[PDB]
């Protein structure tokens, strides 16, 4: 009978969304709590050691991280347990490399290379809105982060809109609304990594969530959850996919 929290992870019990050889060893790195969930994130050491290849062993990877050479959303990260997730930007300036973290169609996490001009912006989905002391408004975003806005400009922000920001400084630019011609990317579910344009939104009673109907390039229509629909543009992707 357990008397307290876990500190170990068996490699067969690790998330599906990882590229990981499950039978090679017994243990896996257990992720520390932080910006994303366990089902939408991977530790840095796996990126530095397995996805890219700049290290063969964990000691080498840890030395790289402690020398201060990997940035995530423009911030130095030295903990090997730090979780990297969807829409995060990974940067290596000694090489000039810049990647965006996204999901596959199977549901696994991949690195898409991008340019230095687009490695300065990151979108955030608004998940909730609160009033906080001083009659101010707090926006609670999809990576668990928070941002403050005033009363006067409160109606410009809603709970499935998207906000594009300069990341190390966190300055807002180009609010994108949830609408009926908006361009959407899917993050979870059976239709993960499909894209298209919103066609319709349906609501249900007694706590059941809302569903969105989408049209893809070829004209095929499909459905998913509104909380799984990530707005990235009005009619054209503001970022590369």
């Amino acid at each position: 009978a357990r008397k307290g929290p876990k500190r170990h992870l068996k490699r067969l019990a690790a998330p599906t969304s990882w590229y990981i050889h499950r039978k090679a060893y017994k243990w896996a790195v257990r992720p520390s709590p932080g910006p994303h969930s366990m089902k939408t994130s991977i530790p840095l050491i796996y990126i530095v050691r397995d996805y890219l290849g700049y290290a063969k062993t964990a000691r080498e990877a840890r030395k790289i991280l402690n020398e201060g050479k990997i940035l995530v959303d423009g911030r130095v990260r030295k903990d090997y347990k730090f979780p990297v997730g969807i829409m995060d930007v990974v940067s290596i300036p000694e090489t000039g490399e810049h990647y965006r973290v996204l999901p596959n169609r199977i549901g696994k996490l991949i690195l898409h290379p991008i340019s230095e001009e687009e490695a300065k912006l990151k979108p955030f989905r608004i998940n909730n809105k609160r009033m906080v002391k001083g009659a101010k408004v707090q926006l609670n975003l999809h990576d668990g982060s928070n941002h403050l806005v005033s009363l006067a400009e409160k109606d410009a922000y809603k709970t499935s809109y998207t906000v594009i920001m300069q990341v190390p400084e966190r300055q807002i630019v180009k609010v994108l609304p949830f609408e009926v011609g908006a361009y959407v990317f899917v993050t979870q579910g059976k239709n993960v990594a499909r894209k298209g344009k919103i066609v319709e939104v349906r609501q249900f009673p007694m706590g059941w969530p809302d569903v969105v109907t989408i049209e893809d390039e070829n004209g095929e229509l499909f459905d998913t959850l509104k909380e799984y629909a990530f707005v990235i543009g009005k009619d054209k992707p503001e970022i590369s996919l």
Partner: protein
């Protein structure tokens, strides 16, 4: 015995060149680390020091063995990054 490079990569974060080469030895035994390093540097214009061979590996019946080496810029970084057992195995260092 002859050598044939097959892939070079540069690691700027660790500061080294990773070199995958083939070795050809027909009717001969598996060559020695000394000879392999000698020919490697004599060909690619490297300093013998600052260079470590990780492995030479032979396969079932091939006469073609595989090898992997690491070329460093400075001996300080070399010794701060590499573990002592391969340095002792090559001979750069005494216990």
């Amino acid at each position: 015995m002859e050598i044939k490079v097959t892939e070079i990569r540069e690691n700027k974060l660790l500061g080294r060149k990773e070199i995958y080469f083939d070795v050809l030895h027909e009717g001969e035994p598996t060559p020695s680390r000394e000879a392999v390093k000698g020919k490697l540097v004599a060909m690619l214009d490297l300093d013998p020091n600052t260079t470590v061979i990780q492995y030479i590996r032979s396969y079932f019946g091939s006469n073609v063995s595989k090898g992997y080496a690491k070329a460093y810029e400075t001996r300080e970084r070399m010794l701060y990054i590499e573990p002592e057992y391969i340095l002792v195995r090559d001979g750069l260092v005494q216990k």
